């Protein structure tokens, strides 16, 4: 195995992570396990979103994920909403929500 991504069973490029971590002025020296471990966290969070996004795509009966599906996926999760609480997704919209007092009689 030549690529360090294969040595860690990860999909995200450990080499590009190691490059960007060094080329960003955060510290003098850079550990060897940090690029592997940072890429794993990134890959897990992307897999979580794509999982809920693919589920929202099945619910909307569409093959391709649109930003509406990402919005529905992130905001229906209790923890992903808190992570991206200060983030607005383009073409995302809002969740359908009508207050109780506003409902008719």
């Amino acid at each position: 195995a030549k690529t360090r991504s294969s040595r860690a069973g990860l999909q995200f490029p450990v080499g590009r992570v190691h490059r960007l971590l060094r080329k960003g002025n955060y510290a003098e020296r850079v550990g060897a396990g940090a690029p592997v471990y940072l890429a794993a966290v990134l890959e897990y969070l992307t897999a979580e979103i794509l999982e809920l996004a693919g589920n929202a795509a099945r619910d909307n009966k569409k093959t391709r994920i649109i930003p509406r599906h990402l919005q529905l996926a992130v905001r229906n999760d209790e923890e992903l909403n808190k992570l991206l609480g200060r983030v607005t997704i383009a073409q995302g919209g809002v969740l359908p929500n009508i207050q109780s007092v506003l409902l008719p009689k």
């Binding site: 195995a1 360090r4 040595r7 860690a8 069973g9 990860l10 999909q11 995200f12 490029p13 590009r16 992570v17 960007l20 971590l21 960003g24 955060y26 510290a27 003098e28 020296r29 850079v30 550990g31 396990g33 940090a34 592997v36 471990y37 940072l38 890429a39 794993a40 966290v41 990134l42 890959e43 897990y44 969070l45 992307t46 897999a47 979580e48 979103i49 794509l50 999982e51 996004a53 693919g54 795509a57 093959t63 391709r64 994920i65 649109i66 930003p67 599906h69 990402l70 923890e79 992903l80 808190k82 992570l83 991206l84 983030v87 997704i89 383009a90 073409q91």
Partner: protein, 93 residues
């Protein structure tokens, strides 16, 4: 001009999880900004941790405690588990 991105790897994870699904160009760039945001948040927190403890290097400990800070409980637990597995798998080979 070469424009780097995490595009091809988001496709791989998408096909690995949902092989019969696609993604749009706008949603693709949204995922790219998500990767860069999480990148900057963790790397920024780890950078602070290095300065705070009078160290000049960012090791795996800084990344692990940074993810403990940024993710809420379950996302942090699963991130530490997936990462420590990959680091042990990398150290093995």
């Amino acid at each position: 001009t070469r424009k780097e991105s995490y595009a091809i790897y988001v496709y791989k994870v998408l096909k690995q999880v949902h092989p019969d699904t696609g993604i749009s160009s706008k949603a693709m760039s949204i995922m790219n900004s998500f990767v860069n945001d999480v990148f900057e948040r963790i790397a920024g927190e780890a950078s602070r941790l290095a300065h705070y403890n009078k160290r000049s290097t960012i090791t795996s400990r800084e990344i692990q405690t940074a993810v403990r800070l940024l993710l809420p409980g379950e996302l942090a637990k699963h991130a530490v588990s997936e990462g420590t597995k990959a680091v042990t798998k990398y150290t093995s080979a």
